Amino acid sequence: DPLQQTGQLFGGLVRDIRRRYPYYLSDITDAFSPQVLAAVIFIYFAALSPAITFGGLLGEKTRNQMGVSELLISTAVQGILFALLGAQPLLVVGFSGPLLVFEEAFFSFCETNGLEYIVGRVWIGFWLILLVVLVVAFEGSFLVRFISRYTQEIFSFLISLIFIYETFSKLIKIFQDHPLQKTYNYNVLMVPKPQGPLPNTALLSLVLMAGTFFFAMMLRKFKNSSYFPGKLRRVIGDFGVPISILIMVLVDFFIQDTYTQKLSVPDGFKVSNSSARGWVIHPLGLRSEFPIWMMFASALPALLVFILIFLESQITTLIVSKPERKMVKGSGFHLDLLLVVGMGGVAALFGMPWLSATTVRSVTHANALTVMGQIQEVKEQRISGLLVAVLVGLSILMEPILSRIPLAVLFGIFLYMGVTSLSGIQLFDRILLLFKPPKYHPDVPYVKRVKTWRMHLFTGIQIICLAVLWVVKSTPASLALPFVLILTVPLRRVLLPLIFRNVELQCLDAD
Amino acid sequence: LAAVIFIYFAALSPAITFGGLLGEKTRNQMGVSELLISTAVQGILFALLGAQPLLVVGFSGPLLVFEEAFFSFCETNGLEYIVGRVWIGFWLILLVVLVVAFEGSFLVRFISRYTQEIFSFLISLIFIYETFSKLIKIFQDHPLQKTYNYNVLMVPKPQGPLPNTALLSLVLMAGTFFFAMMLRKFKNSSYFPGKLRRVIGDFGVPISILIMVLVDFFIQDTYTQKLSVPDGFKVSNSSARGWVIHPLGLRSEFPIWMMFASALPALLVFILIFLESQITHLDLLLVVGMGGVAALFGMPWLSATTVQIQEVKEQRISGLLVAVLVGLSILMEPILSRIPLAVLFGIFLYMGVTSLSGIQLFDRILLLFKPPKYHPDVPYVKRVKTWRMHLFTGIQIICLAVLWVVKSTPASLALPFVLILTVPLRRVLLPLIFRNVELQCLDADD
Numbered sequence: 027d028p029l030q031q032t033g034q035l036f037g038g039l040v041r042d043i044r045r046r047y048p049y050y051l052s053d054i055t056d057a058f059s060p061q062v063l064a065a066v067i068f069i070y071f072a073a074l075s076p077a078i079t080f081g082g083l084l085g086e087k088t089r090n091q092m093g094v095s096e097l098l099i100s101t102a103v104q105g106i107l108f109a110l111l112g113a114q115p116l117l118v119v120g121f122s123g124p125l126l127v128f129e130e131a132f133f134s135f136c137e138t139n140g141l142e143y144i145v146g147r148v149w150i151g152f153w154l155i156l157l158v159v160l161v162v163a164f165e166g167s168f169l170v171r172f173i174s175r176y177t178q179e180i181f182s183f184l185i186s187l188i189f190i191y192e193t194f195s196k197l198i199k200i201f202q203d204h205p206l207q208k209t210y211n212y213n214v215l216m217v218p219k220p221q222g223p224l225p226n227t228a229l230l231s232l233v234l235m236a237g238t239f240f241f242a243m244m245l246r247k248f249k250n251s252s253y254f255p256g257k258l259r260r261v262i263g264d265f266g267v268p269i270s271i272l273i274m275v276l277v278d279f280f281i282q283d284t285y286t287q288k289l290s291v292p293d294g295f296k297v298s299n300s301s302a303r304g305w306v307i308h309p310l311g312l313r314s315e316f317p318i319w320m321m322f323a324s325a326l327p328a329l330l331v332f333i334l335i336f337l338e339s340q341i342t343t344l345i346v347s348k349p350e351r352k353m354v355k356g357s358g359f360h361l362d363l364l365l366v367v368g369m370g371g372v373a374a375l376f377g378m379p380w381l382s383a384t385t386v387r388s389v390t391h392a393n394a395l396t397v398m399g400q401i402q403e404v405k406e407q408r409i410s411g412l413l414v415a416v417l418v419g420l421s422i423l424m425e426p427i428l429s430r431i432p433l434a435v436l437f438g439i440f441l442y443m444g445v446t447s448l449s450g451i452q453l454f455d456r457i458l459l460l461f462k463p464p465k466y467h468p469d470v471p472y473v474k475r476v477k478t479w480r481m482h483l484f485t486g487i488q489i490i491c492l493a494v495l496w497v498v499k500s501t502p503a504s505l506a507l508p509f510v511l512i513l514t515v516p517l518r519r520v521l522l523p524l525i526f527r528n529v530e531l532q533c534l535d536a537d
Numbered sequence: 538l539a540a541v542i543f544i545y546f547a548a549l550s551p552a553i554t555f556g557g558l559l560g561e562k563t564r565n566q567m568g569v570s571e572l573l574i575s576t577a578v579q580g581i582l583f584a585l586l587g588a589q590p591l592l593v594v595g596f597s598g599p600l601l602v603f604e605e606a607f608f609s610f611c612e613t614n615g616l617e618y619i620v621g622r623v624w625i626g627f628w629l630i631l632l633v634v635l636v637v638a639f640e641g642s643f644l645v646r647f648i649s650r651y652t653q654e655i656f657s658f659l660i661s662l663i664f665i666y667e668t669f670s671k672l673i674k675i676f677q678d679h680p681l682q683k684t685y686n687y688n689v690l691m692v693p694k695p696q697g698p699l700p701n702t703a704l705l706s707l708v709l710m711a712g713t714f715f716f717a718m719m720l721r722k723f724k725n726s727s728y729f730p731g732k733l734r735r736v737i738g739d740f741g742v743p744i745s746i747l748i749m750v751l752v753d754f755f756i757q758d759t760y761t762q763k764l765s766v767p768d769g770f771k772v773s774n775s776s777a778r779g780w781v782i783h784p785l786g787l788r789s790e791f792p793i794w795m796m797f798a799s800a801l802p803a804l805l806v807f808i809l810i811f812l813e814s815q816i817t818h819l820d821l822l823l824v825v826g827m828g829g830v831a832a833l834f835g836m837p838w839l840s841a842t843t844v845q846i847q848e849v850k851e852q853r854i855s856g857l858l859v860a861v862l863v864g865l866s867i868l869m870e871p872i873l874s875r876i877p878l879a880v881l882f883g884i885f886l887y888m889g890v891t892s893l894s895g896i897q898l899f900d901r902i903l904l905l906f907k908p909p910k911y912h913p914d915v916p917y918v919k920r921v922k923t924w925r926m927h928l929f930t931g932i933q934i935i936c937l938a939v940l941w942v943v944k945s946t947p948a949s950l951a952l953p954f955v956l957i958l959t960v961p962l963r964r965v966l967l968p969l970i971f972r973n974v975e976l977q978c979l980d981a982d983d
């Protein structure tokens with residue numbers, strides 16, 4: 027069992043290596059297939075666009091201390107290292123919203139207390155490295171065993187819902203920035219960005235997003251549909267998302283006068299704010315000595331960041347590596363955590379962001395590599411992630427190509443990923459059953475062995491938990507969301523059995 | 538009453554759609570008011586006097602395309618369009634009088650599935666083409682450019698490009714189509730109670746129209762073309778026509794040559810009406826006579842597009858009530874004026890795509906791409922070689938293409954006649970290519 031406490035220290039790490047690394051040649055060789063190239067192309071945008079957006083947001087929140095270039099270099103390097111040495115190479119490491127919230131909060135704290143923000147991050151990274159060495163030594167990751175389908179699916183459904191809602195929020199922001207008006211001030215300055223309302227930008231962006239989503243879904247149906255020869259049908263379907271990107275990008279390109287926001291990458295491989303910092307951060311201090319009390323007091327934020335990264339990455343790995351996804355090469359819970367957090371700490375030493383495996387993107391990477399016969403198999407390899415990381419790193423040199431990619435096309439892609447991520451989740455299935463008559467419920471054990479109203483009460487409790495988590499996320503106490511998620515684990519083990527019989531829980535909540 | 542509401546809305550939506558289409562195409566000589574009043578009066582007459590109350594008289598795509606072709610022909614010939622229509626109606630009343638003396642039972646049998654499927658596919662294709670051509674027209678009239686003249690006058694019609702009209706029109710049309718298709722899927726879905734689900738699905742077109750109309754309404758600044766409805770019961774364009782079109786011309790005396798030659802367009806109108814009724818005797822005579830009388834007042838011809846004693850009386854009164862409500866619809870001018878044209882064209886495209894489902898020619902066209910493994914278990918798959926079935930489909934596609942060119946070139950009025958020319962092909966020329974068994978499987982009564 028991958029989750030078992032062995033007497034020997036660092037047992038999880040060594041068994042993880044001994045279980046996965048023998049498959050290295052197979053991992054290298056299994057990437058020789060068109061589906062792998064299509065997944066590479068899809069995940070490249072799926073990971074670069076969030077990277078660019080979060081880098082820009084980080085640059086705005088901080089005094090340009092950490093910006094787009096830093097995040098892009100961190101993502102490229104960490105992705106390459108994880109793909110080459112990761113136990114589960116299908117995971118894709120990247121920045122996340124909670125990490126952005128933590129870095130703005132730590133920035134505010136450091137500014138209030140007068141410390142150096144980047145040096146504080148360096149010390150947080152040192153603390154993270156120490157904590158993870160300690161945890162992996164004692165095989166702490168085994169606690170992830172207690173995370174059942176209940177918590178896994180609540181987390182995954184919530185994350186997908188936030189993804190979709192945020193994409194729609196970006197569309198709404200595009201509309202607000204350029205409201206539909208009778209008259210628009212022409213010859214508006216656009217040097218920093220459009221400084222005022224513009225004509226046809228909002229509606230054209232909406233059309234591009236809708237078209238991209240429609241074409242992606244239609245090509246997916248074509249992949250699952252019966253028309254055309256099987257080989258050509260599947261080849262076209264695997265490249266469905268890339269084909270949609272190409273079609274909508276060309277459609278935008280041929281429109282020569284309307285303005286659609288384009289994906290912009292940093293000018294070159296340089297620190298975003300050269301005056302503020304260099305490439306390497308001196309732990310003692312860039313301009314002033316770092317207080318000793320902070321050297322010792324970074325343990326609390328370091329533990330908070332460790333909890334954030336641990337819960338997200340481990341729950342993402344659990345979701346990705348479920349038995350129903352037909353993963354044979356196995357998965358790693360100790361080596362992956364060690365790699366992710368240690369690389370994050372080393373990056374902090376270099377003034378670069380720390381990343382975590384991200385759920386919508388990891389699930390999308392796994393799905394793009396899934397071969398449907400039911401799921402016949404999954405093309406597990408280390409080349410797709412490595413190529414995605416290399417492309418993310420080289421994006422700075424791919425400015426001419428990337429300047430022609432609208433942001434609305436990527437919004438449509440994000441909607442596609444958010445919609446398709448909801449498919450293999452029992453919580454979503456039961457939510458859908460909330461509207462179907464009991465006559466139409468499928469043939470699943472939790473339907474026959476559990477009365478309709480009892481399972482609907484289960485789904486209602488899960489929906490209440492989802493609402494509570496969303497309220498917490500909206501509240502300025504957002505960084506406490508993971509801990510609230512931990513409160514779900516007792517709920518299944520303590521409170522729910524007081525209301526639900528053992529057989530009903532076993533049928534509804536099963537591995 | 539639920540039934541009289543269903544039919545009332547299902548008649549209003551095509552009525553307003555076709556009225557807008559014709560008012561756009563015919564320069565508002567034939568508009569929404571004409572279609573609404575014609576449908577009301579003719580439905581009253583059909584219910585009170587018709588043999589089959591179930592058959593409902595309403596404007597149809599074949600008649601719309603014929604009227605477009607006749608309008609174009611009148612424009613080229615410099616003849617007044619409505620007067621030519623009333624003379625066509627005169628020839629039609631003479632023809633319907635003739636039909637009484639001479640039985641036409643065999644004519645019903647002569648038309649086969651070949652012609653019916655070709656015709657239905659052609660009208661669906663015409664619908665789709667029109668919804669895309671109107672989209673292209675809107676985009677051309679209001680291009681996408683960096684700067685627009687902001688003092689443009691919109692009194693007769695927007696005299697220059699407008700900022701967001703084109704993309705908003707595309708959005709409204711696509712949204713109407715998507716909503717209609719999604720509600721159609723919902724009708725057969727497993728969600729919600731069966732009765733509520735079926736009720737919502739039946740009102741798919743009205744619900745989509747309402748949603749997109751509200752979407753347009755809440756957008757104030759942007760301008761989208763709106764269906765034009767006279768405030769009262771009056772005619773479409775006062776400058777154009779009166780309630781009683783005078784034979785021998787309104788502005789210029791009607792040519793005598795067209796007086797004599799109206800028979801051929803009347804013959805093609807009768808061909809279209811006959812064939813449209815066939816795919817769905819005394820009822821046809823009543824419809825043709827009512828259309829001929831209507832042509833005098835400038836109202837359009839309407840075909841029975843769609844198809845113990847106490848139940849018959851109930852059907853009669855229900856048809857009468859729906860006709861009366863359709864007639865009174867014009868008194869709802871505000872709401873109709875709020876309705877855009879993008880929504881109506883979206884519903885047009887929805888109908889065009891939906892009509893293709895039943896047609897077997899569409900099924901064969903789809904099968905052309907499908908590998909022979911996935912071909913269905915239908916008799917014309919098992920008992921006919923894929924090569925022969927594909928040859929049948931190809932010949933039908935050639936017939937459709939020839940009909941399309943006939944539509945495109947100036948000799949568009951011949952479109953019905955050429956369609957009838959498929960009957961010889963099926964009866965005479967095809968049996969040479971195909972054996973009796975293969976022909977019977979590929980096309981059949983059922």
Ligand SMILES: CCCCCCCC(=O)OC[C@H](COP(=O)(O)O[C@@H]1[C@H](O)[C@H](O)[C@@H](OP(=O)(O)O)[C@H](OP(=O)(O)O)[C@H]1O)OC(=O)CCCCCCC
Binds near residue numbers: 255905906908909910
């Ligand atoms: C290189 C490009 C290849 C496409 C060229 C097109 C090649 C072509 O025209 O013949 C293929 C196909 C018939 O395929 P065909 O009878 O040979 O059946 C194929 C073959 O028998 C396989 O064994 C089938 O698997 P299975 O053992 O039965 O389970 C496989 O189906 P699938 O189970 O694998 O799905 C089939 O591919 O014909 C079409 O209708 C496609 C219209 C395409 C016309 C569209 C043109 C625009």
Ligand SMILES: *[C@@H]1O[C@H](CO)[C@@H](O)[C@H](O)[C@H]1NC(C)=O
Binds near residue numbers: 088089090091
């Ligand atoms: C870099 O940071 C410094 C901090 O003092 C500040 O001038 C500003 O935030 C940045 N300067 C730039 C981007 O020129």
Ligand SMILES: *[C@@H]1O[C@H](CO)[C@@H](O)[C@H](O)[C@H]1NC(C)=O
Binds near residue numbers: 775
């Ligand atoms: C109204 O009808 C007259 C009749 O000749 C025509 O000239 C005019 O263009 C029409 N106007 C509109 C807006 O349809």
